Design a protein around this nucleic acid. Structure first.
Ligand code: ZN
Ligand code: ZN
Ligand code: ZN
Ligand code: ZN
Lengths: 676, 1263
RNA sequence: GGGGCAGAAAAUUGGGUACCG
RNA sequence: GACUUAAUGUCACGGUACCCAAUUUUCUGCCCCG
């Protein structure tokens, strides 16, 4: 009777932790105390436990498997270990057989749900065949109560997903008020093969997906259902993919005030499905051109909606620095909302439109599709008012880029031959940016790039010919992280020229002695407060400092000024008077963003924070050059502020990759980040 | 067509792994992780023995890496012939993948060898790779290999049976440490193999083409690392003793258990382990501590009879039986066996279950992503190799963690924390700890870095990993093989200020001043500024101290090393690569490079002259120097200091219970340790003092748990999830040379409340350091503060330092009786300015109450009455116990805290004897057995012990407050415990509450709230002079024998009378005029000669209180000074009349948590008046307070009433009967003997009990 | 006619930690 | 010459056994009748 009262004090704590009015920070401690007292009971009565306590141990293992969050991009080992221990602790209860009749139902229910979660998060250890056999035995032991037990619905839906016929169970499945829209849609699709009712239930699921946060399990199950619908070549996966994309967009608009979204692994592949769906509604024969142009515009809106925010990890969110205390409340509100949604799943100003481009400009949106392994370039032309798209492959381009990155990080100036090879590989991979039909001649081009193509010099592309032509010799190149960063009415409104300097190694003594530099905040040994002390919107700001890249948080990447320097977050909060200000940075981009190892990176430098403040354009260096070239750019900008950067790049000798690759290395490094 | 024989030798402990062929290798995690290690195969059946080897594929991989690096150094050519780039890709369509895939970058060059390589003619690199051979990817026959690498067998020097795994390898858990939290992420295990005896391997390499012979023989000497160790490649042309120890341990445990002393065995185990610190002579020549002299029972534990013989003699026979295993192994095995038998006999065997798994992670393979990344250096580039040779010195005791024994067994306790050691019991700094500390300091110097990701198909391109991939280190083994030091640690409950349950543990530390070699190698094009800054940060110069934190107790300040004797040498690899191949890069001979002169350096190795100093380095002084700031101070303690050790006291001569803590310091000039140990206060102790001060000031000690907590205490001092932001070091005594007899012997005893004498088995000694107010001790201490501290946290640390200076937190043990009281603090000039500024910016009172004394005995008849010297106080036997016990976790706002400064005046001569010297003045040369003493003094300054004043005030307070008998003995004559009431029994446990005396002065499981300091002599005439004595002072006392309860309680139906008190009388003049009649007619062994102080002398002492209620402070102020004509009794010779003292309250200060008050005379009367109402409320029978209204207080105060203070020529006669007439000292016709006063005819018993219970009742007329 | 006591009682370990597409 | 490698491709020198805890609480060197 000591085991009885210890099990009841553990079962009270388990059901209090299983209450949807409990905060998760309390839930972890409560469920660990209950698991502690059950584990101590096991330690003292090692092999003489009843099955009634074994089911409590297995339920505690299921509940700790719920509250273990992925702090990165991989499933943690603790969740798999918790599910494994619950499986064997229920296995000894099954080997303790011939107890009560309801105990067999409860034990096989706990076993089947634990095996379902293990098969979901680890397919190799928990196969489909063993799961099919166990869930087959579970309904043989009478686990078909769809009206008082939520988990029996999951058993039936997983079983009909596996392949066995459940035509008898269907009428008992549908009338339950514990079933939800996605389960009813899977029941209508997999058992009765009804497309018509499943479409209505899936649209109801899509409509309910609007108000639930992305950490909820409904998103994972929905994207898995759409991936299964694409797996058997169904006709309904395209519409469901576009509906789920629209729901994800309107949900992602509702996130906390920073450019942040929750990371879940399927969030990419949903976009990678939805893009493909619109693509299959374009290349497949559509008789009217006006719907096809709308589809090619929808592709460029899908890519921009992906490129807006950058999806931080969980450990970086917990290690977030503290400043602007109301935004601290907003960020912790976002974090607790996401974690509460994750466990709640188991406990039961003006964006410029894509056609608002000035005359004589061409906009190139990029997308890297990891499902099909392709790269899509979508071009919008304002003079013709047309939309087109082309494909390329990015594997060998990624290879040559990683070769240049390794050679650069070892021998910074002497990687010029690898830079010429990378530029020729960009020109050979993408011939469509040298033909007249895709990009017209003499027209300004704004690139809106994606993934590792952000770090590629697109202006230095060499055409696949013998007398190879550089790309910047005919077009004016501009860059942008996403189309949501573009603005209207730059409004510089002043004429003051401001300089900041912190480092003394670079021989800028002749630059700081110049007459033109304005009356406020021109320094030597500048600090972060001096950057925050800009009064009213200067014409040109020049920040000369070293750069520091935090390898996990872009919010902790900082510019090396005095007394600790200024970070991305301190830029986004503290500096106010820089609306419509041309900025020139002395820090290279390789010191501002970390080097990358995967094909996908979403990392924003301080130039994007400067654009979010309201600056009109930021001119920087992609990699490290000597101080004389940056001084020459600053002096040419001071003498000529209106003139374009590709003219200076052509005049300095940047068209001579064949004879002097150091000059080509120093010339094409300069990139403007803005949209005039 | 000629074979060559290759010998591979190691100079570091290499790595071993179990052998699985190709698919069972994929089945296991350790096999896939250890693919570049040595392989172990089991031989026979039983899984006990086998043999190790190195596969030829691994040696081939190292060889082709050396060939690639040699050709990349010399622009793609070797000895004039050019080599092409080679092939390192394999198409999947034609052939399979070659069983290992390369992830690193491949060095390439401009290939100009006039031709493309075909089967007919090929370059030396192409035939050395084995491209155009007949066999590939499936082994058919050992011929048709152009170059063939055989398996490298372990060159066992002498042939024997099958080699066991435990004789070569030893497992060890390695770690991954998070940079941001200072905590481990996960761990993994590996096998480290012996290299001193099993570090030579032999194999064969077969070439069939005399065109790649020069390149192969050149690159064999360029291979530097294999199997996790530095290597050279050359070409040639007591299980039985344990069981008897277990049986003798069984005999010892059973002999202890028969004597009901089982729990000593645990202590004994530790003592036997401490016997490894001393030599064998401590058992041989009987250096173990003997018992007290002329005592039938010997030592506390070393004279316990085991099979009729003492434990020292049994240990001597056990050592004589086992002389062949050595002293150290004998003591360690004996202690381990005794601990194992004790843990078996107790019944708890330490289960150690882990929920949610066991965080042991091995790195994993993801398919796809097969990349070939070529790296081409520039033509002109100049590559060099820098070797830094130096010496690590431990500036603090160090700690390198390792698992428990019987867990580092590769095939399949007593000390909680062991230290990493070699096979010859030498201290070891492993390569992995140096590599992790270098990675951490390089991430600090660069400012950015990566957390080390384990599953990777693409090499990380951060600056830290790029510089670390060309840094090679070497493990260091000291030249010292003496055993570690066991340091004990406890934890404190903040509520009761006592030890928590299960909080004792022990750590093994290494000696400070120890010395290890240090080798660093960097191969590259330019020496980095950040690596130079890390080396300059680690090393020490004049003024600067080294900051190399290695090891695993950094918050306790353990493991701060300093680099010295730094010599950096440069090797030119572009011009003098042949000398590198010839000299093997000085691998294994770096010891010779330190003592090498300039003219003895090899060709190619030059000194490096362009090594930047500290001031010229940019990442230094901006990233590394402000990382930790030093705050160094000096505590001045003007009281005795005792941080008890209690295990080494059991193994040292002197027979002392508690001794001070000592350290072992190692010296490098002479290879011994030190002749004399250095006294210290541990870093754990003052770390806990700072932590408790900050936690009580803010209120974070009151929380029930600190998991996932972000309070100020957990931010400053660390928690489970984070490392501490402050690191504490030891407080070392620096003025120990100014003292004569630095350690003082101070002995104490517990006095029974009824008999008035010493309680049985309640006498003890202490040996603290002699601290006096005019000659204080000075302890120099240090702590380091990490950058990032806010103004509030710096304010908190300076407030804690001010609390330590103000005397709120005494050091060591026995702080409530005046030990370890801080008298002052000093702050050095190297402390920063803000910390210095915060630390620098921080009448006749009487009681006027006259008691009406007993008027019937003395104020009626003047000098014709004889009173008994002791009377008994009887109370109502109803005590009030409070279960809401005031806790020590915070300074409560309603309650009072501060100090009372008081002065003590002697009405009568005072005897406080110094029992440190039993010979004292002189006078044992004249006669043997005569005990004579001096007054109690520390360093010549006369003092009263604080324990005496505390016991006197407690014996007054419990009588005033009707408390239980705190010190009481239940003994011979049923027992005295049966006659005593249950309410007056001593309070055991907090469940039934605490009486007010035990609430204020504390119990075992609750610390007291009043602390009594040592009193110091100030003014007056010392040394009451008597002419007929051998000194001018110091009169000789008479007999003093033990009190008998049988006179107090005869005829069993008679209950205990009460607490015994002694009257105030000038009976000392009778002793003063009987000095000639005391030396004769009394045996000289019986009586004692003691130094005496005259009346009128003044002493000064202070009482510190905290968390006091108002009535408790009022009752304390009343017990300190009850009124006019009321005094206390203190010291020796209380029945003879010595020791009446009167205490005046000079001042009272009360503080709040931020100023010091004065509290004028009106409020202390309010406190005493509030205290009086509590006794009125407790009595039940409900103005300046008249204390005689309450019944027991009047009976108490007439006992404490002095009859000669205000003029009265009242001089009462107070003495004992003289047994039998005919006895010396008889008064003429008194009829005053115990024969006529105790015989149930004359004085009827009950009348005698009435006579002993009514104070100042006349006894010779016997009213 | 005579000396006793010379240490006693607790705690002797508890937990924590698995970034890597 | 088996035990015991596969050969045109092994970053394991790719990973600090790391973090948290005051040897401390209570005790007058004291004392008379078989
Ligand atoms: Zn070749
Ligand atoms: Zn790295
Ligand atoms: Zn806390
Ligand atoms: Zn009590």
């Amino acid at each position: 009777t000591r085991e009885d009262i210890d099990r009841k004090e553990a079962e009270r704590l388990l059901d209090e932790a299983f209450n949807p009015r409990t905060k998760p920070v309390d839930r972890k401690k409560i469920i660990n105390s209950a698991l502690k007292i059950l584990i101590g009971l096991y330690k003292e009565k090692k092999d003489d436990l009843t099955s009634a306590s074994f089911i409590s141990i297995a339920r505690a293992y299921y509940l700790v498997s719920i509250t273990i969050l992925p702090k990165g991009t991989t499933i943690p080992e603790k969740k798999k270990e918790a599910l494994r221990k619950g499986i064997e602790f229920i296995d000894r209860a099954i080997n303790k057989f011939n107890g009560s009749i309801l105990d067999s139902q409860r034990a096989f229910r706990i076993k089947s749900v634990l095996s379902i979660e293990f098969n979901r998060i680890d397919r190799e250890k928990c196969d489909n065949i063993k799961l099919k056999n166990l869930l087959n035995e579970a309904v043989d032991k009478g686990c078909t109560d769809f009206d008082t037990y939520e988990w029996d619905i999951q058993i039936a839906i997983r079983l009909c997903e596996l392949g066995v016929d459940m035509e008898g169970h269907f009428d008992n499945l549908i009338k339950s008020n514990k079933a939800n829209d996605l389960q009813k849609a899977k029941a209508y699709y997999f058992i009765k093969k009804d497309d018509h009712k499943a479409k209505e239930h899936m649209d109801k699921c899509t409509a309910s997906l609007k108000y639930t946060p992305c950490s909820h399990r409904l998103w994972d199950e929905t994207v898995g259902f759409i991936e299964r619908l694409k797996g058997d070549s169904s006709t309904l996966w395209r519409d469901f993919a576009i509906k789920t994309y629209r729901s994800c967009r309107v949900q992602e608009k509702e996130t906390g005030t920073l450019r942040l979204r929750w990371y879940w692994s399927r969030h990419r592949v949903l976009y990678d499905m939805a893009f493909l769906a619109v693509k299959e509604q374009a290349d497949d024969e559509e008789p009217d051109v006006n719907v096809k142009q709308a589809k090619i515009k929808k592709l460029a809106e899908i890519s921009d909606s992906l490129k807006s925010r950058f999806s931080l990890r969980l450990s970086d969110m917990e290690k977030m620095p503290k400043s602007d205390d109301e935004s601290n409340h907003e960020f912790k509100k976002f974090l607790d909302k996401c974690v509460t949604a994750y466990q709640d799943g188991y406990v039961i100003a003006k964006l410029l439109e894509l056609t608002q481009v000035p005359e004589g400009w061409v906009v190139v949106h990029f997308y890297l599709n990891k499902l099909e392994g392709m790269g899509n370039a979508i071009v919008f032309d304002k003079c013709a008012n047309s939309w087109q798209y082309k494909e390329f492959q990015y594997k060998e381009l990624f290879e040559v880029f990683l070769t240049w990155q390794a050679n650069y990080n070892l021998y910074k100036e002497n990687a010029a031959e690898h830079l010429v090879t990378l530029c020729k590989k960009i020109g050979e991979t993408m011939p469509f940016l040298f033909c007249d039909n895709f990009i017209p001649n003499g027209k300004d081009v704004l690139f809106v790039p994606h993934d590792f193509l952000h770090r590629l010099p697109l202006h230095g592309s060499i055409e696949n010919k013998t007398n190879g032509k550089l790309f910047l010799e005919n077009h004016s190149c501009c860059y942008l992280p996403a189309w949501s960063f573009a603005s209207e009415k730059e409004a510089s409104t002043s004429d003051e020229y401001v300089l900041l300097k912190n480092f003394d190694q670079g021989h800028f003594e002749t630059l700081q002695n110049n007459q033109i530099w304005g009356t406020q905040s021109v320094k030597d040994g500048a600090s972060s407060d001096d950057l925050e002390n800009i009064r009213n919107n200067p014409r040109l700001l020049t920040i000369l400092c070293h750069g520091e890249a935090n390898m996990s948080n872009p919010f902790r990447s900082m510019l090396k000024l005095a007394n600790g320097g200024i970070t991305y977050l301190e830029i986004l909060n503290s500096v106010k008077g820089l609306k419509g200000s041309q900025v020139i940075l002395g820090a290279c981009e390789t010191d501002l963003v970390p080097p990358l190892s995967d094909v996908m990176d979403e990392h924003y430098s301080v130039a994007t924070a400067l654009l979010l403040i309201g600056a009109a354009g930021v001119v920087g260096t992609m990699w490290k050059v000597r101080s004389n070239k940056t001084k020459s750019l600053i002096e040419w900008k001071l003498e000529n502020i209106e003139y374009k950067l590709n003219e200076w790049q052509k005049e300095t000798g940047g068209a001579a990759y064949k004879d002097h690759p150091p000059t080509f290395y120093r010339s094409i490094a300069f990139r403007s980040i803005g949209f005039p | 067509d000629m074979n060559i024989t290759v010998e591979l030798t190691f100079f570091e402990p290499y790595r071993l792994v179990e052998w699985f062929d190709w698919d069972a290798r994929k089945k296991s995690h350790s096999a896939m992780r250890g693919q570049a290690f040595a392989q172990w195969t089991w031989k026979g059946k039983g899984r006990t023995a086998g043999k190790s080897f190195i596969t030829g594929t691994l040696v081939r991989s190292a060889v082709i890496k050396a060939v690639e690096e040699l050709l990349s150094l010399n622009n793609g050519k070797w000895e004039g012939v050019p080599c092409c780039n080679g092939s390192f890709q394999t198409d999947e369509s034609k052939g399979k993948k070659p069983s290992f895939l390369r992830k690193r970058h491949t060095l390439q060059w401009q290939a100009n060898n006039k031709n493309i390589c075909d089967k007919e003619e090929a370059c030396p690199f192409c035939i050395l790779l084995g491209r155009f051979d007949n066999a590939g990817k499936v082994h058919e026959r050992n011929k048709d290999y152009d170059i063939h690498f055989s398996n490298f067998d372990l060159d066992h020097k002498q042939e024997k049976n099958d080699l066991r795994l435990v004789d070569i390898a030893s497992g060890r858990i390695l770690n991954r440490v998070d940079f941001d939290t200072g905590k481990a992420k996960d761990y993994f295990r590996t096998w480290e193999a012996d290299y001193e005896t099993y570090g030579t391997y032999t194999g064969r390499i077969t070439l069939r083409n005399e065109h790649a012979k020069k390149l192969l023989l050149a690159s064999l000497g360029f291979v530097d690392k294999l199997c996790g160790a530095l290597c050279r490649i050359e070409v040639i042309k007591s299980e039985d003793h344990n069981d008897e120890l277990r049986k003798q341990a069984e005999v010892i445990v059973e002999a202890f258990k028969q004597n009901d002393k089982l729990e000593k065995i645990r202590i004994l185990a530790d003592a036997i382990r401490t016997l490894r610190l001393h030599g064998e002579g401590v058992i041989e020549k009987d250096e173990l501590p003997d018992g007290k002299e002329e005592r039938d029972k010997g030592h506390h534990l070393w004279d316990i009879k085991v099979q009729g013989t003492a434990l020292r003699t049994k240990l001597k026979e056990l050592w004589q039986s086992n002389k062949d295993i050595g002293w150290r192994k004998f003591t360690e095995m004996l202690g381990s066996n005794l601990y194992l038998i004790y843990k078996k006999e107790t019944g708890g065997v330490s289960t150690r279950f882990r929920i949610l798994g066991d965080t042991e992670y091995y790195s994993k393979d993801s398919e796809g992503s097969d990349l070939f990344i070529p790296v081409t250096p520039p033509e002109g580039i100049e590559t060099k190799e820098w070797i830094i040779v130096g010496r690590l010195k431990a500036a603090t005791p160090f700690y390198f963690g390792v698992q428990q024994p019987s867990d580092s067994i590769p095939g399949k306790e007593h000390t909680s924390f062991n230290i990493l050691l070699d096979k010859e019991n030498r201290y070891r700094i492993p390569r992995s700890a140096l590599r992790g500390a270098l990675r951490r300091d390089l991430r600090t110097a660069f400012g950015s870095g990566c957390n080390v990701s384990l599953g990777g198909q693409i090499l990380c391109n951060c600056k830290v990993c790029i510089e670390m991939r060309r840094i090679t280190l070497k493990d260091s083994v000291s030249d010292f093989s003496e055993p570690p030091e066991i340091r004990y640690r406890i934890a404190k409950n903040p509520g009761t200020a006592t030890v928590e349950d299960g909080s004792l543990f022990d750590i093994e530390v290494g000696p400070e001043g120890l010395t290890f070699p240090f080798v660093l190698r960097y191969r590259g094009h330019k020496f980095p500024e950040q690596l130079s800054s890390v080396i300059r940060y680690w090393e020490e110069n004049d003024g600067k101290n080294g900051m190399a934190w290695l090891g695993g107790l950094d918050s306790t300040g353990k493991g701060r090393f300093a680099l010295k004797d730094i010599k950096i040498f440069e090797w030119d690899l572009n011009q003098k690569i042949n000398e590198y191949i010839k000299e093997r890069g000085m691998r294994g001979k770096e010891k010779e490079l330190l003592e090498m002169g300039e003219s003895s350096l090899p060709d190619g190795l030059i000194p490096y002259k362009f090594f930047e100093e500290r001031e010229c380095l940019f990442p230094y002084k901006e990233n590394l120097k402000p990382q930790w700031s030093e705050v160094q101070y000096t505590i001045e303690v003007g009281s005795p200091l005792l941080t008890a050790d209690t295990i080494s006291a059991l193994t040292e001569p002197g027979n002392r219970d508690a001794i001070a803590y000592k350290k072992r310091v190692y010296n490098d000039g002479n290879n011994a340790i030190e002749p004399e140990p250095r006294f210290a206060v541990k870093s754990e102790t003052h770390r806990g003092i700072f932590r408790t001060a900050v936690g009580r000031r803010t209120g974070d000690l009151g929380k029930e748990d600190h998991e996932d907590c972000t309070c100020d205490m957990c931010i400053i001092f660390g928690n489970e999830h984070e490392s501490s932001k402050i690191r504490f070091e030891d407080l070392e005594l620096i003025n120990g040379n100014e003292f004569e007899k630095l350690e003082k012997h101070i002995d104490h005893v517990a006095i029974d409340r009824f008999t008035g004498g010493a309680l049985d088995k309640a006498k003890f000694d202490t040996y603290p350091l002699a601290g006096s107010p005019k000659k204080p001790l000075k302890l120099k201490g240090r702590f380091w503060i990490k950058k990032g501290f806010s103004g509030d946290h710096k304010l908190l640390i300076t407030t804690a330092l001010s609390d330590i200076r103000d005397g709120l937190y005494p050091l060591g043990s026995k702080g409530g009786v005046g030990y370890g009281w801080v008298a002052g603090i000093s702050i050095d000039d190297n402390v920063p300015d803000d910390f210095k500024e915060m630390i620098n910016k921080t009448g006749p009172i009487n009681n006027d109450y006259v008691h009406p004394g007993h008027q019937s005995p003395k104020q009626d008849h003047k000098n014709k009455n004889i009173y008994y010297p002791h009377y008994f106080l009887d109370s109502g036997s109803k005590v009030y116990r409070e279960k809401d016990i005031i806790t020590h976790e915070e300074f409560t706002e309603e309650l009072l805290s501060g100090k009372i400064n008081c002065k003590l005046e002697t009405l009568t001569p005072l005897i406080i004897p110094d029992t440190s010297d039993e010979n004292g003045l002189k006078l044992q040369g004249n006669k043997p057995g005569h005990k004579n003493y001096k007054f109690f003094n520390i360093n010549g300054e006369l003092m009263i012990p604080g324990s005496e004043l505390r016991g006197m005030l407690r014996t007054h307070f419990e009588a005033l407050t009707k408390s239980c008998f705190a010190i009481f003995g239940e003994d011979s004559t049923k027992t005295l415990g049966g006659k005593l009431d249950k309410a007056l029994h001593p309070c055991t446990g907090l469940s039934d509450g605490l009486c007010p005396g035990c609430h204020l002065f504390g119990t075992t499981d609750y610390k007291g709230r009043v602390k009594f300091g040592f009193a110091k002599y100030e003014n007056g005439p010392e040394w009451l002079i008597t002419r007929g004595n051998n000194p001018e002072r110091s009169l000789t006392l008479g007999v003093l024998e033990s009190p008998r309860p049988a006179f107090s309680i005869p005829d069993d139906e008679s209950e205990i009378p009460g607490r015994k008190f002694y009257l105030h009388h000038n009976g000392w003049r009778i002793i003063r005029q009987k000095q000639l009649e005391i030396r004769e007619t009394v045996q000289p062994e019986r009586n004692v000669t003691t130094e005496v102080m005259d009346k009128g002398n003044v002493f000064s002492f202070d009482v510190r209180f905290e968390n006091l209620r108002e009535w408790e402070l009022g009752l304390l102020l009343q017990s300190l000074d009850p009124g006019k004509n009321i005094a206390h009794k203190l010291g020796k010779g209380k029945p003879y009349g010595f020791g009446s003292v009167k205490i005046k309250i000079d001042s009272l200060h009360t503080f709040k948590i931020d100023k010091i008050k004065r509290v004028p005379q009106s409020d202390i009367r309010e406190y005493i008046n509030k205290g009086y109402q509590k006794l009125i409320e407790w009595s039940g029978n409900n103005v300046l307070p008249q204390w005689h209204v309450i019944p027991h207080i009047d009976k108490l105060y007439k006992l404490l009433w002095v009859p000669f203070l205000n003029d009265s020529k009242l001089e009462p006669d107070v003495r004992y009967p003289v047994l039998n007439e005919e006895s010396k000292g008889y008064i003429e016709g008194s009829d005053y003997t115990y024969k006529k006063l105790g015989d149930k005819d004359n004085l009827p018993y009950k009348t005698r009990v009435k006579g002993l219970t009514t104070p100042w009742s006349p006894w010779n007329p016997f009213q």
